[PDB]
Amino acid sequence: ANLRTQKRLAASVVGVGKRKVWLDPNETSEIAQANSRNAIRKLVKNGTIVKKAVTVHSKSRTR
Amino acid sequence: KDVVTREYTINLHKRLHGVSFKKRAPRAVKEIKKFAKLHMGTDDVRLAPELNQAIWKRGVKGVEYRLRLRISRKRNEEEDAKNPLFSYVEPVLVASAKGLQTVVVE
Amino acid sequence: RYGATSTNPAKSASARGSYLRVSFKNTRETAQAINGWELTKAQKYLEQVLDHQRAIPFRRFNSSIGRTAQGKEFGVTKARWPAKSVKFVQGLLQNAAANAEAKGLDATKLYVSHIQVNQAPKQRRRTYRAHGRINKYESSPSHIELVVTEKEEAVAKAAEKKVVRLTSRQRGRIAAQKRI
Amino acid sequence: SHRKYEAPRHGHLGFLPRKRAASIRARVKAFPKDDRSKPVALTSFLGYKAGMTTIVRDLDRPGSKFHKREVVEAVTVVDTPPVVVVGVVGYVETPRGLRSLTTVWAEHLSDEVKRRFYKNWYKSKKKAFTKYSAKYAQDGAGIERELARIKKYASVVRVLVHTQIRKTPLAQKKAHLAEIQLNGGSISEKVDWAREHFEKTVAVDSVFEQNEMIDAIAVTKGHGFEGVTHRWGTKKLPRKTHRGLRKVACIGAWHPAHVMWSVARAGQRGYHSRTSINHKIYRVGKGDDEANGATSFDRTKKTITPMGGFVHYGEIKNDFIMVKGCIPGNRKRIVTLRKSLYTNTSRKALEEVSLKWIDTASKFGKGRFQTPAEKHAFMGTLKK
RNA sequence: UGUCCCUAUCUACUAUCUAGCGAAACCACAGCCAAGGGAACGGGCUUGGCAGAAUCAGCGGGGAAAGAAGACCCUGUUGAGC
RNA sequence: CCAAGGUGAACAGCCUCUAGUUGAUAGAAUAAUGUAGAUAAGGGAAGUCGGCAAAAUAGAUCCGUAACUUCGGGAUAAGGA
RNA sequence: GAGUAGGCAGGCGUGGAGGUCAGUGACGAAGCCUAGACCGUAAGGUCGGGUCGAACGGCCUCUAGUGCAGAUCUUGGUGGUAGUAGCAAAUAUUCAAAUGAGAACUUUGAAGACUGAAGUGGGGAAAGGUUCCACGUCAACAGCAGUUGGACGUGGGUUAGUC
RNA sequence: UGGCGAGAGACCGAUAGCGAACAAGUACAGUGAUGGAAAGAUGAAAAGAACUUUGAAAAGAGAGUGAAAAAGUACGUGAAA
């Protein structure tokens, strides 16, 4: 139950911040056993980890 | 004591009337827990994360005047407490949570 | 070992807790609230004072502390709810009660006959005061040790005679009042 | 050296100590001088403060600038539902003052005055005055003996009398019991009146006439600690003052090398047993009457109760008294109104008051209208 | 223009109560007054007044309260800058 | 050292995106006195050593601008819309 | 038959020293504790009881780093104040699950917020020196807590013809 | 009053004696020159507490070792505040 090396690794692997990394709250046993960067790369393909799409900043009121 | 599910209205307006603005939503959480205790005689309340989102959606200082919520007194498990029943509060989805009297869902 | 007791070791069980990091003054007061009780009434009372129903009456270390209504039970005005102390002595009540069962004492008449809280060596930290001074910041840990004995009535019955000494005048007046 | 500029002292040195009047009742410390000629009657009367309203009246004061001119006066109303007689105490005069020789009660005391004697009532078996009520088993032998005692001895006679809190909008149930002295004929007449009125109610129309002065006695509003410059209202020290303005600067000198009793000091004030004098009776209204608010110059079917009820208190369905000016004590409080200890004859007494109009606008705001009929008439007819 | 006549009210954070953690200054012994005498302004002495456990929040009269072998003045057959 | 969008003269203040934190003992209650913010009828420095503190004024466009001057200034004078 | 400053005399007590009592002593020396006892005007001495465990004493003499309440004495320890003052500036946290003996503080999810690119972003200089990272773990430290950590235990890690 | 090797004492006996009886000019302070501690004793022998039971654990109560645990690696004796 120490997935901070997994948040850090996920963020660095996918190529976004640690603020844009959703680890699966139901699938915790698997993301604990994730140690390598290759393990994280496999879990992002399964969709256990995602990119958690950008907070939109509309330029509509600007336009 | 029985296993029941009722739908209550709570006047959060009069319960949060004259509170510090940055402890209004946290006080609303604590006063719904006190409300669930009063009506279900239960010392364990379990606010749904959906009810949390409902109280907090309009910031720390914008708690809606009234809230229509559902309180299910349920048989307890999970390392048996001193209280054999716990109350699980959820938010009911009504467009205007006003003019509604307490009912029972079966 | 185990400070002065006037009870029978054949009918006793004890429990010791050395260098326990609790406020000495708080844990002296929980011990003096629980002293000379039944072990059942004692155990129940310590769970009540954890969930804020009854309070530990602070008698000696009762300086500028807030008053409370839960003191009226004990004829005091000032009482408190030392969670940490209550939890440590609870651990030692339970452990004593376990030894008292393992030796074979009826758990019903089992009443706390001796409870003593001594001071441990103080643990050393340093605080930092205005104008670049250092001060001490000391914890005062505790040496708790308690005894639980079986209750027995039918005592004293004690003790001595009227082994009397009299004069010729006394004994003569006794012999007279008999003749009367 | 001396003050340099001498001012009069802050605070009266007579209303001390400024502590919390031990009771919550008012505690009448003096009754009138006890006239032995005129018929037996109650002196003071228990009641409950409801709230304040405005009145308008013509003014008979020859020499005054406002002779024969409408004047607005503030008025406070006291709910006075008939107070039930439940006892009579005999007091003998001694070289250590008056002392209670004995008290005798009626066998039937209402659940109202029974609730008084318990603090955890609904757990109780309600066994109060069971054996005392069973002393009326035969022809009240114990009663006739103790009443014969109070007749033979007892140079003073007082009545134990309790309020009817069930009739008030108050949520108490626990009727305030009080002693109230009888000022009437021979002690035998006083004992017989206190007996004959057992288990009966006494109303306010008997005790208090109209245009008669009254001494409102009550405990004031709380306010808690209420710091230095509000209880005596001493000077606020200059903006530049370090450690606080809201204070008294110099307690005292040395020699005497002690803080003094005369010095103004901090600590709880408000909730003191106060007695105000010369409150002229304006209305003694009845509960057996709609058009309580109706004067001889209005004739409108409204009650003294404003629109939306007396704020914080409720509706006044019982016989009441509205009295001129402010009287001490909060709303929902237990007041005792006592007759004048002397004959005030200062042309403010002897002065026959005739009311022209009573304010019944909703004083839960800046109410425009006196009655729902006027609101509907002026506005309307939307939208219900 | 609340600086003031003249104060009032409100907000937040304190204080307050609780759980936890937990110092320091100071401390002859200590802690009720009046007068008296007295190192000429007493907590203690003499004579009076009196005097009832345990205490909580405040307060700034007193403890000639605390901080520092007066820096002013003098002395010293003590120095230093000028 | 690198340095986004909007308002705006602006790298000012206020709000957001990327990225980053959500750490500073907590719970309850809202007395006095404080500390940091505020408001006040009428009067308007009477307060006070002393207008100390606060209040008022404020951006931009147009109008207008005195004594004095080392003829450069004063000057955003003042006073308005 | 008083007595400060002061003088002198007679003794009491301590560390050692020479001589002696063929001194006492593991069947208990010395030390310490003692609302027990006896002697002495006193300094002090002697004895009983307890704890303890390896030495010590009377007397005749020699010798002195030889007797404490004060020195804002020294060192060390301890208090009363006192569970008091306080742990209140950087807007703010809340719900659930998981973990665990234990969760306000840990991990994840979900909200609500802030820093607002002259930042609470991303690199560096000097300075530090392994704090970096992993696993195991919580007696001490993180002025609450602790399962967490810049802590604790064991390891792993810094690659240059062009910087 | 140095260095090396030896004999000694009416000396000191762990706040004494050298600053240092101990991993002492050590730890540590200061930029630097320099400043500079505290800290010895279980028992004859570790025989350093097998094994049982309460507790998550530290530990507790037993059992045992020992001549003694009123010797438990917080260790001879264990004063006073």
Curated annotation (Swiss-Prot), chain A:
Component of the large ribosomal subunit (LSU). Mature yeast ribosomes consist of a small (40S) and a large (60S) subunit. The 40S small subunit contains 1 molecule of ribosomal RNA (18S rRNA) and 33 different proteins (encoded by 57 genes). The large 60S subunit contains 3 rRNA molecules (25S, 5.8S and 5S rRNA) and 46 different proteins (encoded by 81 genes). eL19 lies in close proximity to the binding site for eukaryotic initiation factor eIF4G. It is found in: Cytoplasm. Component of the ribosome, a large ribonucleoprotein complex responsible for the synthesis of proteins in the cell. The small ribosomal subunit (SSU) binds messenger RNAs (mRNAs) and translates the encoded message by selecting cognate aminoacyl-transfer RNA (tRNA) molecules. The large subunit (LSU) contains the ribosomal catalytic site termed the peptidyl transferase center (PTC), which catalyzes the formation of peptide bonds, thereby polymerizing the amino acids delivered by tRNAs into a polypeptide chain. It comes from the Eukaryota. It comes from Saccharomyces cerevisiae (strain ATCC 204508 / S288c) (Baker's yeast). There is a cross-link at residues 20, 52, 59 (Glycyl lysine isopeptide (Lys-Gly) (interchain with G-Cter in ubiquitin)). One of its GO terms (cellular component) is cytosolic large ribosomal subunit. GO terms for molecular function: RNA binding; structural constituent of ribosome. Present with 97700 molecules/cell in log phase SD medium. This is Large ribosomal subunit protein eL19A. Residues 58-63 have a biased composition (Basic residues). Its main location: cytoplasm.
Curated annotation (Swiss-Prot), chain B:
Gene3D superfamilies: 3.10.440.10. It is found in: Cytoplasm. GO terms for cellular component: cytosol; cytosolic large ribosomal subunit. InterPro entries: Ribosomal_eL31, Ribosomal_eL31_CS, Ribosomal_eL31_dom_sf. Keywords: Cytoplasm, Ribonucleoprotein, Ribosomal protein. GO terms for biological process: cytoplasmic translation; regulation of translational fidelity. The keyword Ribosomal protein applies. It comes from the Eukaryota. One of its GO terms (molecular function) is structural constituent of ribosome. The keyword Ribosomal protein applies. Component of the ribosome, a large ribonucleoprotein complex responsible for the synthesis of proteins in the cell. The small ribosomal subunit (SSU) binds messenger RNAs (mRNAs) and translates the encoded message by selecting cognate aminoacyl-transfer RNA (tRNA) molecules. The large subunit (LSU) contains the ribosomal catalytic site termed the peptidyl transferase center (PTC), which catalyzes the formation of peptide bonds, thereby polymerizing the amino acids delivered by tRNAs into a polypeptide chain. PANTHER family: 60S RIBOSOMAL PROTEIN L31 (PTHR10956:SF0). Belongs to the eukaryotic ribosomal protein eL31 family. There are 2 genes for eL31 in yeast. This is Large ribosomal subunit protein eL31A. It comes from Saccharomyces cerevisiae (strain ATCC 204508 / S288c). The gene is RPL31A.
UniProtKB/Swiss-Prot annotation, chain C:
GO terms for biological process: cleavage in ITS2 between 5.8S rRNA and LSU-rRNA of tricistronic rRNA transcript (SSU-rRNA, 5.8S rRNA, LSU-rRNA); cytoplasmic translation. It is found in: Cytoplasm. It comes from the Eukaryota. Keywords: Cytoplasm, Isopeptide bond, Phosphoprotein, Ribonucleoprotein, Ribosomal protein, Ubl conjugation. There is a cross-link at residue 44 (Glycyl lysine isopeptide (Lys-Gly) (interchain with G-Cter in ubiquitin)). The modification Phosphothreonine is found at residue 68. Pfam families: Ribosomal_L22. InterPro entries: Ribosomal_uL22 (IPR001063), Ribosomal_uL22_CS (IPR018260), Ribosomal_uL22_euk/arc (IPR005721), Ribosomal_uL22_sf (IPR036394). GO terms for cellular component: cytoplasm; cytosol; cytosolic large ribosomal subunit; preribosome, large subunit precursor. GO terms for molecular function: structural constituent of ribosome. Belongs to the universal ribosomal protein uL22 family. Component of the ribosome, a large ribonucleoprotein complex responsible for the synthesis of proteins in the cell. The small ribosomal subunit (SSU) binds messenger RNAs (mRNAs) and translates the encoded message by selecting cognate aminoacyl-transfer RNA (tRNA) molecules. The large subunit (LSU) contains the ribosomal catalytic site termed the peptidyl transferase center (PTC), which catalyzes the formation of peptide bonds, thereby polymerizing the amino acids delivered by tRNAs into a polypeptide chain. PANTHER family: 60S RIBOSOMAL PROTEIN L17. There are 2 genes for uL22 in yeast. This is Large ribosomal subunit protein uL22A.
Swiss-Prot record, chain D:
Methylation at His-242 by HPM1 is required for proper 60S subunit assembly and promotes translational elongation fidelity. Transmembrane segments: none annotated. PROSITE patterns: RIBOSOMAL_L3. There is a cross-link at residues 38, 135 (Glycyl lysine isopeptide (Lys-Gly) (interchain with G-Cter in ubiquitin)). GO terms for cellular component: cytoplasm; cytosol; cytosolic large ribosomal subunit. The modification Phosphoserine is found at residues 23, 155, 296. It is found in: Cytoplasm. The modification Phosphothreonine is found at residue 102. Component of the ribosome, a large ribonucleoprotein complex responsible for the synthesis of proteins in the cell. The small ribosomal subunit (SSU) binds messenger RNAs (mRNAs) and translates the encoded message by selecting cognate aminoacyl-transfer RNA (tRNA) molecules. The large subunit (LSU) contains the ribosomal catalytic site termed the peptidyl transferase center (PTC), which catalyzes the formation of peptide bonds, thereby polymerizing the amino acids delivered by tRNAs into a polypeptide chain. This is Large ribosomal subunit protein uL3. It comes from Saccharomyces cerevisiae (strain ATCC 204508 / S288c) (Baker's yeast).
